[PDB]
Ligand binder design. Structure first.
Ligand SMILES: Cc1cc2nc3c(=O)[nH]c(=O)nc-3n(C[C@H](O)[C@H](O)[C@H](O)COP(=O)(O)O)c2cc1C
Ligand SMILES: C[As](C)(=O)[O-]
Ligand SMILES: [Zn+2]
Length: 118
């Protein structure tokens, strides 16, 4: 299953290298041709990065799930980028993790995506 991601300061990028899954960095040109899972980070006050918003405006029909990187010091806005995307596009939240994730977060993501890919 293809993973589309974005990363400003490298934490999500670190996570997706731990996955060893097919992965593509999103861009404004990018048109994805197959089902994919998004991994986004979370911007101030529970928000979705603009580059991700722009990409999803164009690519949401192939979106099958979303995970967010965030930080629990944001309390109930932790990972709320995923809550927004999930609600808007009616796709599951695969997972939430902090920063570049733990090994357990990596494993958990892959297990959940295997389920959704069925
Ligand atoms: C200014 C700023 C605001 C943030 N806002 C939130 C937030 O509302 N919720 C959250 O869970 N994480 C928040 N984060 C944490 C980032 O989402 C987290 O560091 C993430 O791992 C960054 O991913 P990246 O390194 O791939 O850009 C914020 C970080 C910064 C610098
Ligand atoms: C987005 As890449 C080439 O570092 O896997
Ligand atoms: Zn790389």
């Amino acid at each position: 299953m293809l993973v589309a991601y974005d990363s400003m300061t490298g934490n999500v990028k670190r996570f997706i290298h731990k996955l060893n899954m097919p992965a593509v960095q999103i861009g404004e040109d990018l048109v994805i041709d197959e089902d994919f899972i998004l991994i986004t980070y979370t911007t101030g006050f529970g928000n979705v990065p603009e580059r991700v918003l722009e990409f999803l405006e164009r690519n949401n029909e192939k979106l099958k799930g979303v995970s967010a990187s965030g930080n629990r010091n944001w309390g109930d806005m932790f990972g709320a980028s995923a809550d927004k995307i999930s609600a808007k596009y009616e796709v599951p939240i695969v997972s939430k993790f902090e920063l570049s994730g733990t090994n357990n977060d990596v494993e958990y993501f892959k297990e959940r995506v295997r389920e959704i890919a069925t």
